[PDB]
Nucleic acid binder design. Structure first.
Ligand SMILES: [Mg+2]
Ligand SMILES: [Mg+2]
Lengths: 320, 71, 130
RNA sequence: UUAAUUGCGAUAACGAACGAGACCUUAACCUACUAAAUAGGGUUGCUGGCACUUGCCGGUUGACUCUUCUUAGAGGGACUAU
């Protein structure tokens, strides 16, 4: 069932380091902000004309070191960048200048999260801590509880929780081999998740916000319930799964293995498609793996940022 | 000196154009300018790294030496 | 003339042998790891140490290499060592329960006072010219 | 193989010490941080001249503001990285 084929449609050249992270806003479907190892963000405008799927719009210089995680705002006009210089930068997606410079992490920041609304900034850093900031730039909360580095923090979207609660729930993980849930208003702990043999490389809550997918070094992908606080399922990728991403339309998990990109069909608990682009002049032992994954707003296109300094887009083209 | 100043103005004008286009114009224009520039006298956007070598005793030059008598 | 003298090589070897699960393929991540898990005095030596650690990690990923060892590799070696075939490689499981011996060892078996299933065959005393 | 008794190694040699390297000073690169009437810049004053269109080149220790260059501290950066 669902004989869905996805084919590479364009390549977004222009970066100069590994495209570490990607982000897309639901409101604005034709804009894509990508941060790379070249210490710069790039805003891409997507064109449905010919070979190139997008067009770079603005490069955001101002970061001294590696840019790890990139998050766009809900409205699609602001972008928060986490870099390896222990600082966070807020950028106006049109002006190109920085608005706020969040400072306070003693270790280089690895991930950043946007609030459901435009209120709070959640940042994870190597200093074993999480920081909650306002949009102005000051740090409101210093959440502890992790004894090692925290690599990924992405907010669980509130779908239909009771009506309304004014409570902000997200997850956090890193080299502590644990996954933690946090609730904000106040701004304290929630349930835990201990399933990983090795340390967690990346976590990503489902678009609805009730499934949390975590991945690690051993390629052991775990899927948990947050609102139920229980395990949902478990698979093995048998490679290095660098990044993973849910899909808005389909019930799918893209996983960036060290060898290629797997897609897991969640309802059938079986992988369906594998993505391995064709490079040239290599030795098949160091083919550029994927480090960043991001689906489109609808769930029609997939953006993958590789170590070959390239964004490649796979458009879903169901060949019957 | 004179020619050093001239090359400084060259670099200043080129880098100013590129930075302005990056800041307020567009990415494609900036990359086109960089392709036009760096394909011609790479120093136009990249500062030269060669600079004078400190002098040393026993030599009237930075790397030269005095004459030897030998007899 | 970059040869990476004793100190960096030994330090990287110990780093791999004590921290292989945490080490990665990337230079920058391993650089931060070197900063956190080891007290390298200067930073040029830290960078050299991380670079050689990455090189040794890449060599290990390509395959097993001499000198360095760690828990995972030693466990895999022991597991491969514990391999014993369930099928028998002796006691005439092959050659339809017949072993081929010449006359002399047949007389050896006879004079030993033992009756084993033998199969006499002359050894053609003519020797190969090599 | 290395500039190197520098390493890979083979081994009645095993472990080590000095030297080399490491290390400091200096020269780079920092539109990232801290800042500056004993360094510079912008806007605006108060003026000079020419143009006459709102602009150009100036002067002022008059104000507001900034740190790109100039400085110097903490740091980053290159480890033969891919
Ligand atoms: Mg001279
Ligand atoms: Mg400066």
């Amino acid at each position: 069932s669902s004989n869905i084929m996805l084919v590479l449609r364009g390549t977004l050249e222009g970066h100069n380091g590994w495209v570490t992270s990607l982000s897309t806003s639901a409101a604005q479907p034709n804009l894509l902000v990508s941060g790379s190892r070249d210490k710069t963000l790039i805003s891409w405008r997507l064109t449905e004309n010919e070979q190139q799927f997008g067009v770079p719009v603005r490069s955001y210089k101002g970061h001294s070191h590696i840019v790890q995680d990139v998050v766009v705002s809900a409205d699609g006009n602001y972008a928060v960048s986490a870099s390896w210089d222990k600082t966070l930068r807020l950028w106006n997606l049109a002006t190109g200048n920085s608005e706020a410079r969040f400072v306070g992490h003693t270790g280089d920041v690895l991930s950043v999260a946007i609030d459901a609304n435009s209120s709070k900034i959640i940042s994870a850093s190597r200093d074993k801590t999480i920081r909650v900031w306002n949009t102005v730039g000051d740090c409101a909360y210093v959440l502890l509880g992790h004894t090692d580095w925290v690599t990924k923090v992405r907010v669980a979207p509130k779908n239909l929780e009771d009506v309304d609660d004014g409570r902000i729930t997200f997850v956090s993980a890193g080299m502590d081999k644990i996954v933690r849930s946090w609730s904000l208003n106040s701004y304290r702990i929630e349930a835990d998740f201990i399933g990983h043999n090795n340390y967690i490389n990346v976590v990503q809550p489902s678009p609805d916000g009730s499934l949390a997918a975590s991945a690690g070094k051993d390629g052991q992908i775990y899927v948990w319930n947050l609102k139920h606080k229980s395990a949902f399922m478990n698979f093995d990728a048998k490679d290095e799964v660098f990044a993973l991403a849910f899909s808005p339309s389909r019930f799918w998990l893209t996983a960036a293995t060290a060898s290629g990109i797997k897609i897991y069909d969640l309802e059938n608990e079986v992988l369906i498609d594998e993505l391995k682009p064709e490079f040239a002049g290599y030795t098949k032992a160091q083919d550029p793996h994927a480090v960043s994954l991001a689906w489109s707003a609808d769930g029609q296109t997939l953006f993958a940022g590789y170590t070959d300094n390239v964004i490649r887009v796979w458009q879903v083209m169901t060949a019957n | 000196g004179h020619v050093s100043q001239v090359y400084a103005i060259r670099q200043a004008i080129a880098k100013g154009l590129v930075a302005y286009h990056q800041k307020f114009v567009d990415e494609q224009s900036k990359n086109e300018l960089k392709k036009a520039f760096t394909s011609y006298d790479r120093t136009l956007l990249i500062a030269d790294s060669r600079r004078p070598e400190p002098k040393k005793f026993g030599g009237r030059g930075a790397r030269s030496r005095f004459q030897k008598s030998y007899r | 003339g970059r040869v990476r003298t004793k100190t960096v090589k030994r330090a990287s070897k110990a780093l791999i042998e004590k921290y292989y699960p945490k080490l990665t393929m990337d230079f920058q991540t391993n650089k931060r790891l070197c900063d956190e898990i080891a007290t390298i005095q200067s930073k040029r030596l830290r960078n050299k140490i991380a670079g050689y650690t990455t090189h040794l990690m890449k060599r290990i990923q390509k395959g097993p290499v001499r000198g360095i060892s760690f828990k995972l590799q030693e466990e895999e070696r022991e597991r491969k060592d514990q391999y014993v075939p369930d099928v028998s490689a002796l006691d005439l499981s092959h050659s339809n329960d017949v072993l081929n011996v010449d006359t002399q060892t047949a007389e050896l078996v006879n004079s030993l006072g033992l009756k084993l299933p033998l199969s006499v065959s002359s050894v053609s005393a003519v020797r190969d010219r090599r």
